Amino acid sequence: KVFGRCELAAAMKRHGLDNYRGYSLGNWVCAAKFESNFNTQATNRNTDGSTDYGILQINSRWWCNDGRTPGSRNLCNIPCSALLSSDITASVNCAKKIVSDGNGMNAWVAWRNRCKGTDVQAWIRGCRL
C-alpha cells in the first residue's frame, strides 16, 4: 500500500507514535517519507547482506527474520514480510522497540541525515489529526 501523507500521519497517531519517546508525529512521517516514500512494500539490500523492510525500512540484522540474514537477531519476533503489510501495526510496534534501544531515532540513518534539525512539523501541515 502507498499511503497518503495525512493518511499515514493518522495511522501512526492512532498506533501511539505521536511523541513516542518524545518524537513528535512529524519526525515519524519525515522518516517514512525518506525511507519508503510511504510504500509498505519497500525493500532495500544493505551492504552487509541484511535487508531493510517496509514503511520504516526496519532491518533484518537485528529486528526481523527474513530467512537469509546469517548471524542476525529477530528482536521484534516477526518475519520481515510482516513489515510489508497494508496494516502498519507490525512496523509501528517494532519501531517502538527500535527507538527505545538507546540511540532514539538516530537508529534511522535517513532520519538523522534528512529529518533531525529540520522543520518536521511541515510533514503533518494541513492534516486532520
Near Rh ion by CB under 5 A: residue from 2, 18, 61, 66:
18
| x/- letters, 88..127, toward Rh ion (CB under 5 A) | ----------------------------------------
Candidate list 7, 18, 48, 52, residue with the active-site label: 52
Which residue, 18 or 66, is less far from Rh ion as judged by CB? 18
The region of 10-18, 42-50, 70-78, 91-99 touching Rh ion under the rule CB under 5 A is: 10-18
Q: Tell me the longest C-alpha to C-alpha distance in the chain.
A: 45
- What three-state secondary structure class fits 104? helix
The three cell numbers of residue 126 are 494541513
35 in active site: yes
Q: Mind giving me the DSSP string for 52-68?
A: EETTTTEETTTT-B-S-
Residue 101 marked ligand-binding: yes
Distance CA 29, CA 49 (A): 27
- Least distance in Å: CB of 26 to Rh ion? 9
52 in active site: yes
Distance CA 30, CA 20 (A): 15
CA 46 from chain center: how many Å?
Answer: 16
| Chain residues in the site for Rh ion (CB under 5 A) | 18
Binding site, residues? 101
The residues that are catalytic are 35, 52
